[PDB]
Scaffold this motif. Structure first.
Motif, PDB file in Angstrom:
ATOM      1  N   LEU E  27       0.862  -1.211   0.000  1.00  0.00           N
ATOM      2  CA  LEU E  27       0.000   0.000   0.000  1.00  0.00           C
ATOM      3  C   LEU E  27       0.887   1.246   0.000  1.00  0.00           C
ATOM      4  O   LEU E  27       0.878   1.973  -1.010  1.00  0.00           O
ATOM      5  N   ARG E  28       1.634   1.467   1.084  1.00  0.00           N
ATOM      6  CA  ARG E  28       2.515   2.661   1.186  1.00  0.00           C
ATOM      7  C   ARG E  28       3.643   2.560   0.150  1.00  0.00           C
ATOM      8  O   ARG E  28       4.371   3.556  -0.021  1.00  0.00           O
ATOM      9  N   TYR E  29       3.779   1.405  -0.510  1.00  0.00           N
ATOM     10  CA  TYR E  29       4.817   1.246  -1.563  1.00  0.00           C
ATOM     11  C   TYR E  29       4.192   0.697  -2.848  1.00  0.00           C
ATOM     12  O   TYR E  29       3.030   1.041  -3.135  1.00  0.00           O
ATOM     13  N   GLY E  30       4.944  -0.125  -3.588  1.00  0.00           N
ATOM     14  CA  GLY E  30       4.454  -0.653  -4.878  1.00  0.00           C
ATOM     15  C   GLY E  30       3.855  -2.038  -4.754  1.00  0.00           C
ATOM     16  O   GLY E  30       2.870  -2.179  -4.018  1.00  0.00           O
ATOM     17  N   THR E  38       0.459   7.541   0.880  1.00  0.00           N
ATOM     18  CA  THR E  38       1.228   8.271   1.867  1.00  0.00           C
ATOM     19  C   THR E  38       0.832   7.814   3.231  1.00  0.00           C
ATOM     20  O   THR E  38      -0.360   7.654   3.511  1.00  0.00           O
ATOM     21  N   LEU E  39       1.841   7.547   4.058  1.00  0.00           N
ATOM     22  CA  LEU E  39       1.510   6.846   5.269  1.00  0.00           C
ATOM     23  C   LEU E  39       0.261   7.432   5.778  1.00  0.00           C
ATOM     24  O   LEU E  39      -0.693   6.700   5.981  1.00  0.00           O
ATOM     25  N   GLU E  40       0.186   8.744   5.743  1.00  0.00           N
ATOM     26  CA  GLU E  40      -0.971   9.470   6.144  1.00  0.00           C
ATOM     27  C   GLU E  40      -2.100   8.653   5.632  1.00  0.00           C
ATOM     28  O   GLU E  40      -2.657   7.836   6.366  1.00  0.00           O
ATOM     29  N   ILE E  42      -2.477   6.024   4.123  1.00  0.00           N
ATOM     30  CA  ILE E  42      -2.386   4.557   4.399  1.00  0.00           C
ATOM     31  C   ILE E  42      -2.745   4.263   5.864  1.00  0.00           C
ATOM     32  O   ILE E  42      -3.573   3.361   6.083  1.00  0.00           O
ATOM     33  N   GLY E  43      -2.164   4.990   6.823  1.00  0.00           N
ATOM     34  CA  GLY E  43      -2.413   4.705   8.248  1.00  0.00           C
ATOM     35  C   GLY E  43      -3.870   4.359   8.478  1.00  0.00           C
ATOM     36  O   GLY E  43      -4.144   3.311   9.092  1.00  0.00           O
ATOM     37  N   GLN E  44      -4.774   5.195   7.967  1.00  0.00           N
ATOM     38  CA  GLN E  44      -6.228   4.969   8.167  1.00  0.00           C
ATOM     39  C   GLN E  44      -6.718   3.956   7.129  1.00  0.00           C
ATOM     40  O   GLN E  44      -7.623   3.165   7.462  1.00  0.00           O
ATOM     41  N   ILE E  45      -6.131   3.973   5.928  1.00  0.00           N
ATOM     42  CA  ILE E  45      -6.571   3.057   4.833  1.00  0.00           C
ATOM     43  C   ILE E  45      -6.788   1.649   5.396  1.00  0.00           C
ATOM     44  O   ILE E  45      -7.899   1.116   5.213  1.00  0.00           O
ATOM     45  N   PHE E  46      -5.779   1.070   6.057  1.00  0.00           N
ATOM     46  CA  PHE E  46      -5.918  -0.343   6.509  1.00  0.00           C
ATOM     47  C   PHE E  46      -6.810  -0.431   7.757  1.00  0.00           C
ATOM     48  O   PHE E  46      -7.666  -1.337   7.792  1.00  0.00           O
ATOM     49  N   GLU E  51       0.351   5.741  15.078  1.00  0.00           N
ATOM     50  CA  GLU E  51       1.551   5.276  15.829  1.00  0.00           C
ATOM     51  C   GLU E  51       1.860   3.811  15.501  1.00  0.00           C
ATOM     52  O   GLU E  51       2.664   3.205  16.237  1.00  0.00           O
ATOM     53  N   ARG E  52       1.255   3.264  14.444  1.00  0.00           N
ATOM     54  CA  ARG E  52       1.454   1.823  14.124  1.00  0.00           C
ATOM     55  C   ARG E  52       2.033   1.671  12.711  1.00  0.00           C
ATOM     56  O   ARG E  52       2.182   0.519  12.258  1.00  0.00           O
ATOM     57  N   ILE E  53       2.343   2.792  12.051  1.00  0.00           N
ATOM     58  CA  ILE E  53       2.870   2.778  10.718  1.00  0.00           C
ATOM     59  C   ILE E  53       4.353   2.737  10.543  1.00  0.00           C
ATOM     60  O   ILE E  53       4.915   1.674  10.351  1.00  0.00           O
TER      61      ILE E  53
END
Lengths: 449, 707, 250, 226, 78, 58, 21, 226
Positions: E27-30, E38-40, E42-46, E51-53
């Motif tokens: 997700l945050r990569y390829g 963007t972790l941003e 992504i953090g919520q995406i999953f 604080e878990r990214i």
């Protein structure tokens, strides 16, 4: 298991093989074929077998045969200058005599080897089975006869020698001529072929066996191909591997062979040749129904292995390559059956001399007849050798121009005649003056000049 | 190959014809060529006939017709004294002209009252009195490599055609030896190459190291009868720039090498036109094309069976038949609008055969072995990036390798090369700056290579003897000879067939005579003035007598002429048929195995049409034309066909993923449609079409169309 | 050749690498492949056999023009080539060249084997005639083998009885390669020049009509049917016959 | 039986060590095969020593010349090969060569560590002149036979460390043949007429010996070995 | 091909440690078609996180890093 | 032997095509199924396929 | 038919087209 | 090294002693003619024993028949030759043969002595019927060459003392061949694939031995002998 005492080399192994084939697998044969080539070699070696200018024997009466021919020409010209006889004339024979000798040689030589060579090369390889041909072994010792000029005029004085003697120049040239011509040709008919096929295949591209059902019971007849009493093709083969529209019926002196739809294997052929049948009728895809193709059944054996074709195979394009190829080698006697003379039935052959004139002389037209086909020349009434009456023109290498000497040209044997003109050039510098004929004037037979 | 390529003359060309627009009878031996154009002589290909070369003696008048030297025979008898007769620029001298092959009575007179003659383009029985003209010789109409055949007179023409040519293609060797039996006519030929070095003038050599003959700019008796008479402008006496250099190993238009060792001694006496050092393959100052080895004629099983040649090992063990070849390799650097791209010593990813046999600019030192993948010269390229798959960014991350940025097109020896390096030739602003507009350096590099003979080499005699090596036998297995001297080739006996080149035995034999007699002998085609073969009783004669000058006895056997016994190495016996034996002069031919070898798993494709890039240098591919496919669908199960038509040439994706699919370890997937179809669509479409390739599916039969 | 055989087979091999595990990734292989590790000349040829190949001398309309072939490695750079197949392709060896391709799907292998494998096609598809045929010298080997040198004296008119006896005698030259001699063989001749009819039967006693033939020599009547069976054949021909024979059945 | 002599052995002058070797009885074919067998092995695998690698040092590689010396490098070497050199250590005893002046150069010139030795000097080598240097040294070995830059120094030491390939031969040539000793009566017999020429560095005889050795060797452990 | 190998080679080799986190690895990569999320985002995406990214991020890398783990692309650095 | 089997195989079966293909696919399965079971490097799945179809099947 | 299948790629009236057919 | 190893010994069955024999390596100059060399000698001169002279006693000479027995004398003998018989004495180990009745006859029937015993009975000799009386005995010897009485003997024998000529063979056939065996990073090498078939009366191996013997024998007097 059939032990066979015979000199094997070319053909002996050919049919052998087949034989094997039918009777055994391929696989085997192959591996046969192999083992034996393997012989072939090693013995060959062991024999050790070389050739050389000396190995190129000469047939002794090379001599007589030859300069005889010469004095021929002497007569030739004798009256020729002496205007009994003349140029298109005596000359269309100072020509023929040569090529008759040419046969004469053709003979003395082979005949000779035929009675010599205790396993000698020209008998262990040539004469038997090897690249040796005759054709080129003729003039490996023989005397070349006339040949020609760049185009198709056969130059007068033949190519007297062969390659021991080695030529002298002129020839040498002449010789060239030919060779060039041959060349450039080649450079052409190359394409010409490839071209074909390419059509062929195009036209004959997809007659694929589609279909065993087919139907119909008609076919077509066959019969050996038999130009003159020469019968080109033992019916036999020609039958190979087809299917017999109806029952091949021997002279009822026997009963019924091969009903029908009978893939006609060889054996069967060879014999029912020798029940003398004469034709037979063979599901000809020239007819028989099979959509845009030939009836699987009405096709017959596939020479690819001498067994009926499989299925869904474009026999068309296949029948194209087959034809196509050899096309390439369209170039466009031996076993001393007698000597350099050939199929001379009982006593006589007829031609033209006006463009030869030097007395009893002549170039060529056709021949007639009475074909007892045994030494005497051409006629009936039996010769010495093999006595059963026949009748028709007969290829006799020794052809015509009487033997002013040793033979008036042979090596064009013929079992379309347009005009040309008599040089009567000034044969010297003096008071020309004609007479006793003076030119019955006209504009009918010449034209208007 | 030069000469004959200078005095070549041609019909085509602007002003001429074309091949097509001119056909045939315009290719033939118009009987006027006689004497003027060697009829024996021609490429083929189509060009037969279109390209002739020049007879030997011919030459041309300022109009540019070929005056033909002859001889004025008076009362049908040439006085000889006449310095020939430089007239007859055209064949219509019209006259009694004699073919320069005449049994000639000593002292003029002709002999036979049946001397032929051409005349008005005809041959014609003539008599000796009423004749005018004789050719100067019986071997003039022919040309180079044709009038040289040892015993021409005795062969097919065409074969001798081939002969000639072969002769032109014989690579030259370390020391090609003057053959044994030769036609006399050659010393000259050499001499006029101008591949040798010729007494310019005159002088008695003095200083001669292997690079020049300072018998020249030295100043002593050489250079100084290079002071005897002392040229117009030239260095009239001194040590003169008759300093001929002499040049070692330069590449040829065929990559062959050439060089001329001093050859002459020191302190001695030369006159102009003499010859000083020797070109590639010439030897005593005379032509020498190949060598001469002892041959036998037998049918060695398999190898030699047919159009195959055996060979002892000593053959090339004695360094005979090995030649040189050397090699251009250039490479160049060039301002990408990304930048320059360069030449470093340094390149990524190196270590041995890379940054090892490499100079500070990543070049090589002169004189360096190399091998098949090593670096000639290394240069990189401003590659950068600006286009990458996230997976690549990964794999960084893991190694977090901040990768580099530079393709690195070093120059590598390709494969199948060896061999020292001779040279380099850098080319930049300072180094001549000979380069395309915007290049910086150009580098040449030259690499050489001995090569011994080896199986697989056209190699033939002087008589259309096109043959290929097959096995080499360690020397202790060949049939050797009665004296145990191992023979060493062994051709097929049965000869003079379609080749009609019996001529070559003749001389083998002969050679062998002068091989046992150990004496060379010149000769000439058309040994006439002799009712009998003449050449035939020479040669015997010589042999004959060759016995007894050594009494070796087996030197000559009238019974079975020149046949010999032979044992054979492998086990030790002769056979029922003695085999001839001779030396013979063979010759090895440029187009060498490596010149034609190829392979392609896969490689570069085409542009437009992606099908592998088949052209000969570079990973090409075998083209399967219709007639080829006519051998596939003509067979039974023809998948292959199919696929061959595609996955190894076009379904692009098809290609790949097949490839893969094998790498996986399983079969391959079903193909798709090749390209070049799709292409054809396009065109056609681009030309007022409405192609509906299309399906007809559903129970409702569905008509669609597609990409 | 080794050089080409690789590339032809390139991949397949690398596969095998990875199978043997010796090679891990491919580039691994790739590299190693150029290093010609033992495997490169060890694995390969296991990859290779069995795996037919197709050869062709220039564009060839004829289907047989190209067939299937087993790639065996070999050193120099040529293609070895068999004489028996030469005619088909019609090759010299004056410098012809050929070209190779290789088949992939496995299916496409099948039918190489199955139906182009140069063995099994013996005979011209344009004519039942065979096309493999021992052609030159090998003929004249066989000729010379089997010819009939006159004056044949060494081991002439001798006698033999199977075992390939006569052979032995031959290596001991008890007879001459060319030398007529009786041979016990109960089978059939063909002689050429058929003689079937007798000649000079030897009417003496039991089965002794016992009877000659221009070749044979035999025992019927009381003796039995053919108890005697000596063939008037040169000691070569026997070889030959033998050589077939055994190659053929057994 | 197997009694042998030497009709005449000029193994002294070298080059051709002409030496007929008359046998006495032999068996049918023996002379031929037993003669043969030698021959082969004689030729084929004895010991010899010879140069392999050369150290010009004027020079990169073969295609240099070198001043003042008549003969382009190669042929020099080429004249190497044939110099003739017996050894004993069977190792790489390097001899030099540093010559000058105006002159010819002879095999002897080579300054090897003896125990090796020219066989026979006066083999013509090179022809220096003016201010040359003929800087030479080079190797020797007692390698098997006709090493073709295979088991020699290749793709290795190259700095002036150019090498050759070479023969090893000891023996030039050999024949033999066979005659009927006229023993036909009891049993025809056989004499073998060997003869042999060696290069020089070795008589015949010992050559024989050597061979014989070899053979004997070979057969020796073939008696029901398995 | 070589490439595409890479894909999977990886895939598994990654896809053998924390399958959920493996998602963000792609997700945050390829490993698909973002370089990125963007972790941003992504953090919520999953599962919505802050604080878990980058913790499990580095964790993932260092995990599949070091010999035996990264030593699989060590040869297939494609 | 496999050779003679290969022969017998198609010396007494359906279209020489028809065969093959089914030899083929078979081996295809012989390869797909038993994927790299016994190395098979020598007895190619095709070869198997043949023998097990030219002798086992026969 | 044939000659196209080729031109075109797919295979032949025979082959699987004759097997499955 | 250079050790031979039996691989396909079938000596068990009467003949077909057939036994491939491989040689770890061979070095250059071996098999191609070392294999060879055997072959020759193998074939050629070993020891064998076999009948030579026969004592029908019904009979003058070859052209008799003899009652009651199917097979004219000659062929009988002719079937002599091939009976197979090992001796150890080589002397006149005469065995008889006397048999009646109706029957076939085989080597076993022959009352040969303990010496020249049958190898392998059941060689079918012959066929008699009607209580026909046999009277056979005949000789044996050991002997080398396949040897015709022309050289064998013409004479003393002059009373039912008809004799044959004969072989002696021990060995039926033999080949070999050679492979390059790689390990060429250390010179290409060589293995010899001998193989051999003997009649029976002898294994191979010892055959070899014997040969080898022979060779070695002749090969011993070849080291500087002269």
């Amino acid at each position: 298991m059939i032990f066979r005492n015979r000199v094997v080399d070319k053909g002996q192994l050919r049919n052998l093989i087949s034989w094997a084939f039918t009777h055994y697998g391929t696989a085997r044969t192959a591996v046969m074929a192999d083992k034996l080539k393997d012989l072939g070699f090693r013995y060959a070696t062991r024999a050790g077998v070389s050739i050389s200018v000396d190995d190129l024997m000469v047939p002794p009466s090379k001599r007589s045969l030859l300069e005889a021919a010469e004095e021929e020409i002497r007569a030739t010209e004798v009256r020729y200058q002496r205007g009994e006889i003349t140029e298109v004339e005596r000359f269309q024979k100072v020509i023929d005599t040569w090529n008759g000798t040419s046969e004469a040689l053709k003979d003395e030589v082979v005949t000779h080897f035929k009675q010599t060579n205790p396993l000698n090369s020209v008998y262990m390889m040539a004469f038997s089975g090897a690249r040796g041909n005759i054709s080129q072994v003729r003039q490996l010792v023989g005397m070349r006869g006339l040949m020609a000029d760049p185009q198709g005029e056969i130059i007068d004085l033949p190519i007297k020698t062969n390659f021991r003697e080695g030529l002298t120049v002129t020839e040498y040239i002449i010789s060239s001529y030919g060779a060039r011509k041959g060349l450039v040709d080649t450079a052409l008919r190359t394409a010409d072929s490839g071209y074909l096929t390419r059509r062929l295949v195009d036209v004959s591209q997809d007659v694929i066996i589609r279909e065993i059902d087919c139907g119909t019971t008609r076919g077509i007849p066959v019969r050996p191909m038999t130009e003159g009493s020469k019968t080109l093709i033992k019916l036999s083969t020609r039958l190979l591997g087809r299917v017999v529209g109806e029952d091949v019926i021997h002279p009822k002196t026997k009963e019924v062979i091969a009903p029908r739809n009978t893939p006609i294997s060889d054996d069967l052929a060879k014999e029912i040749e020798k029940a003398g049948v004469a034709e037979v009728v063979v599901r000809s895809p020239l007819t028989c129904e099979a959509a845009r193709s030939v009836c699987q059944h009405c096709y017959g054996w596939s020479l690819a292995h001498a067994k009926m074709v499989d299925l869904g195979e474009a026999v068309g394009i296949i029948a194209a390559q087959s034809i196509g190829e050899p096309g390439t080698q369209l170039t466009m006697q031996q076993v001393r059956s007698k000597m350099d003379g050939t199929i001379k039935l009982p006593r006589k052959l007829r031609t033209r001399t006006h463009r030869t004139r030097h007395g009893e002389d002549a170039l060529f037209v056709e021949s007639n007849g009475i074909m007892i086909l045994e030494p005497r020349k051409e006629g009936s009434e039996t010769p010495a050798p093999q006595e059963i009456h026949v009748t028709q023109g007969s290829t006799i290498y020794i052809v015509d121009g009487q033997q002013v000497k040793k033979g008036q040209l042979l090596a064009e044997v013929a079992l379309n005649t347009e005009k040309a003109v008599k040089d009567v050039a000034s044969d010297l510098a003096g008071e020309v003056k004609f007479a006793e004929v003076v030119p019955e004037q006209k504009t009918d037979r010449q034209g208007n000049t | 190959a030069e000469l004959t390529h200078k005095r070549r003359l041609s019909a085509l060309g602007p002003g001429g014809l074309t091949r097509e627009r001119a056909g045939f009878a315009v290719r033939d031996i118009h009987p006027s060529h006689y004497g003027r154009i060697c009829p024996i002589e021609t490429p083929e290909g189509p060009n037969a006939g279109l390209i002739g070369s020049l007879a030997t003696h011919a030459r041309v008048n300022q109009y540019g017709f070929l005056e033909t030297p002859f001889r004025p025979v008076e009362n049908g008898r040439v006085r000889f004294d006449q310095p020939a007769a430089y007239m007859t620029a055209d064949e219509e001298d019209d006259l009694r002209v004699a073919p320069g092959d005449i049994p000639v009575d000593e002292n003029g007179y002709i002999i036979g009252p049946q001397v032929p003659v051409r005349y008005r383009q005809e041959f014609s029985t003539t008599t000796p009195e009423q004749v005018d003209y004789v050719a100067v010789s019986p071997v003039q109409i022919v040309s180079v490599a044709t009038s040289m055949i040892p015993f021409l007179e005795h062969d097919d023409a065409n074969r001798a055609l081939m002969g000639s040519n072969m002769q032109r293609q014989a690579v030259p060797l370390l020391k090609p030896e003057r053959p044994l039996v030769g036609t006399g006519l050659e010393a000259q030929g050499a001499r006029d190459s101008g591949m040798v070095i010729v007494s310019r003038t005159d002088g008695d050599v003095v200083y001669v190291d292997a690079t020049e003959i300072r018998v020249r700019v030295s100043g002593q008796l050489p250079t100084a009868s290079g002071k005897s008479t002392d040229n117009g402008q030239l260095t009239s006496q001194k040590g003169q720039e008759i300093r001929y250099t002499v040049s070692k190993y330069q590449r040829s238009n065929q990559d062959t090498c050439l060089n001329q060792k001093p050859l002459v001694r020191i302190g001695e006496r030369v006159v102009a036109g003499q010859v000083l050092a020797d070109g590639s393959s010439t030897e005593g100052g005379e032509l020498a094309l190949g060598q001469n080895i002892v041959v036998a004629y037998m049918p060695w099983e398999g190898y030699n069976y047919e159009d195959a040649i055996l060979i002892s090992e000593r053959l090339v063990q004695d360094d005979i038949y090995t030649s040189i070849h050397i090699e251009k390799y250039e490479i160049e650097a060039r301002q990408t609008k990304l930048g320059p791209e360069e030449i470093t010593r340094e390149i990524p990813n190196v270590g041995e055969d890379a940054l090892r046999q490499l100079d500070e600019q990543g070049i090589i030192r002169i004189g360096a072995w190399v091998e098949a993948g090593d670096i000639l010269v290394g240069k990189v390229t401003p590659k950068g990036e600006s286009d990458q798959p996230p997976e690549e960014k990964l794999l960084r991350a893991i190694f977090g390798e901040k990768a580099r940025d530079v393709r690195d097109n070093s120059l590598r020896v390709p494969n199948g090369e060896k061999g020292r390096v001779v040279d380099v030739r850098l080319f930049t602003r300072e180094q001549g700056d000979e380069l395309p507009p915007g290049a910086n350096m150009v580098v040449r590099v030259y690499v050489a290579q001995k090569r011994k003979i080896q199986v697989g080499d056209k190699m033939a005699g002087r008589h259309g003897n096109k043959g290929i090596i097959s096995r080499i036998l360690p020397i202790e297995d060949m049939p050797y000879l009665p004296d145990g001297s191992p023979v060493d080739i062994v051709l097929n006996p049965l000869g003079v067939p379609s080749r009609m080149n019996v001529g070559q035995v003749f001389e083998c034999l002969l050679g062998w005579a002068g091989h046992t007699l150990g004496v060379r002998f010149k000769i000439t085609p058309f040994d006439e003035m002799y009712g009998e073969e003449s050449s035939r009783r020479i040669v015997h004669g010589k042999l004959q007598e060759a016995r007894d000058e050594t009494g070796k006895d087996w030197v000559y056997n009238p019974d079975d002429p020149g046949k010999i016994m032979v044992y054979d190495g492998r086990t030790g016996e002769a056979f029922d048929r003695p085999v001839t034996i001779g030396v013979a002069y063979m010759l090895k031919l440029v187009h060498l195995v490596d010149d034609k070898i190829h392979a392609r798993s896969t490689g570069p494709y085409s542009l437009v049409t992606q099908q592998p890039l088949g052209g000969k240098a570079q990973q090409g591919g075998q083209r399967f034309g219709e007639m080829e496919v006519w051998a596939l669908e003509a067979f039974g199960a023809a998948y292959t066909l199919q696929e061959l038509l595609t996955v190894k040439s076009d379904d692009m994706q098809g290609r790949n993923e097949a490839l893969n699919a094998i790498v996986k370890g399983k079969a391959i997937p079903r193909p798709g449609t090749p390209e070049s179809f799709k292409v054809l669509m396009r065109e056609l479409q681009s030309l007022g079409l409405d192609i509906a390739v299309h399906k007809v599916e559903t129970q409702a039969d569905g008509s669609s169309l597609d990409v | 050749p080794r050089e080409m055989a690789i590339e032809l087979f390139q991949p397949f091999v690398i596969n095998r690498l990875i199978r043997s595990g010796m090679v891990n990734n491919i580039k691994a292989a790739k590299k190693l492949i150029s290093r010609n590790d033992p495997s490169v000349w060890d694995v390969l040829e296991e990859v290779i056999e069995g795996h037919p190949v197709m050869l062709n001398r220039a564009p060839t309309l004829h289907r047989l023009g190209i067939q299937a072939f087993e790639p065996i490695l070999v050193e120099g750079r040529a293609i070895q080539l068999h004489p028996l197949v030469c005619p088909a392709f019609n090759a010299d060896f004056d410098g012809d060249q050929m070209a190779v391709h290789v088949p992939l799907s496995l299916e496409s292998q099948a039918e190489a084997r199955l139906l182009m494998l140069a063995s099994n096609n013996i005979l011209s598809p344009a004519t039942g005639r065979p096309i493999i045929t021992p052609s030159q010298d090998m003929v004249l080997g066989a000729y010379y083998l089997t010819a009939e040198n006159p004056g044949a004296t060494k081991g002439a008119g001798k006698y033999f009885a199977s075992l390939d006896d006569v052979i032995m005698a031959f290596q001991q030259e008890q007879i001459d390669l060319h030398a007529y001699v009786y041979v016990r063989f109960d089978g059939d001749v063909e002689s050429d020049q058929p003689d079937t009819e007798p000649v000079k039967v030897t009417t003496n006693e039991d089965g002794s009509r016992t009877v000659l033939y221009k070749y044979r020599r035999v025992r019927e009547d009381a003796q039995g049917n053919v108890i005697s069976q000596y063939i008037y054949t040169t000691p070569g021909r026997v070889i030959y016959n033998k050589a077939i024979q055994e190659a053929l059945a057994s | 039986q197997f009694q042998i002599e030497c009709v005449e052995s000029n193994t002294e002058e070298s080059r051709n060590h002409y030496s007929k070797f008359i046998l006495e009885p032999l068996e049918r074919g023996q002379g031929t095969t037993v003669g043969n067998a030698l021959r082969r092995v004689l030729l084929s695998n004895l010991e010899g020593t010879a140069v392999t690698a050369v150290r010009i040092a004027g020079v990169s590689h073969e295609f240099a010349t070198v001043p003042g010396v008549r003969e382009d490098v190669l042929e020099i070497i080429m004249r190497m090969k044939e110099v003739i050199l017996k050894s004993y250590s069977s190792q790489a005893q390097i001899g030099r060569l540093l010559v000058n002046g105006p002159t010819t150069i002879t095999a002897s010139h080579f300054d090897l560590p003896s125990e090796v030795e020219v066989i026979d000097p006066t083999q013509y080598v090179a022809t220096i002149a003016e201010g040359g240097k003929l800087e030479m040294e080079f190797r020797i070995e007692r390698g098997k036979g006709y090493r073709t830059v295979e088991r020699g120094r290749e793709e290795a030491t190259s700095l002036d460390f150019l090498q050759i390939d070479s023969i090893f031969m000891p023996v030039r040539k050999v024949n033999y043949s066979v005659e009927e000793v006229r023993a036909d009566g009891s049993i025809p017999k056989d004499r073998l007429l060997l003869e042999v020429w060696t290069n020089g560095s070795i008589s015949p005889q010992e050559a024989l010996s050597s061979a014989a050795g070899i053979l004997v060797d070979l057969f020796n452990p073939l008696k029901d070995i398995s | 091909v070589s490439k595409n190998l890479l894909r999977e080679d990886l895939e598994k080799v990654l896809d053998s440690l924390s399958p959920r986190e493996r998602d963000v690895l792609r997700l945050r990569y390829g490993l698909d078609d973002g370089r990125m999320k963007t972790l941003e985002e992504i953090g919520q995406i999953f599962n919505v996180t802050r604080e878990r990214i980058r913790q499990i991020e580095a964790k993932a890398l260092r995990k599949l890093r070091h010999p035996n783990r990264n030593s699989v692309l060590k040869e297939y650095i494609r | 032997q496999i050779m003679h089997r290969a022969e017998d195989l198609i010396s007494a079966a359906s279209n020489r095509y028809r065969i093959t293909v089914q030899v083929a696919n078979r081996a295809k399965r012989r390869r797909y199924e038993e994927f790299e079971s016994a190395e098979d490097a020598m007895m190619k799945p095709v070869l198997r396929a043949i023998i097990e179809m030219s002798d086992e099947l026969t | 038919g044939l000659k196209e299948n080729v031109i075109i790629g797919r295979l032949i009236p025979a082959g699987t087209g004759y097997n499955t057919y």
